[PDB]
């Protein structure tokens, strides 16, 4: 398991991403305030670690904003769409 992967657990699961109910490992764009999802991932990632250029926020932000960008074109995921739904 991806560490990085279960900040998403909650920072995606504040609502700001969609993920599928037998899809937990993946992540679908919805178009909502990622400004509150990042914050929610710094949130959850690290109290307010607020420092010098030390601690770059960069990080997350680049995290979820990979995650988002990666995924991102996506907004139902493909596997239901390839399958069938019970
Ligand atoms: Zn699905």
Redesign the pocket.
Request: proline residues 0%.
């Given at each position: 398991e991806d560490q990085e992967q279960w900040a998403m657990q909650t920072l995606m699961g504040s609502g700001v991403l969609a993920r599928?109910?037998?899809?937990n490992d993946?992540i679908l764009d919805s178009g909502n305030d990622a400004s509150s999802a990042y914050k929610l991932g710094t949130y959850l990632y690290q109290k307010d670690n607020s420092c010098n250029l030390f601690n770059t926020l960069t990080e997350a932000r680049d995290a979820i904003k990979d995650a988002y960008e990666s995924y991102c074109g996506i907004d139902?995921?493909p596997?239901?769409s390839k399958?069938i739904?019970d």
């Open positions: 599928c109910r037998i899809h993946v139902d995921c596997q239901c399958y739904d």
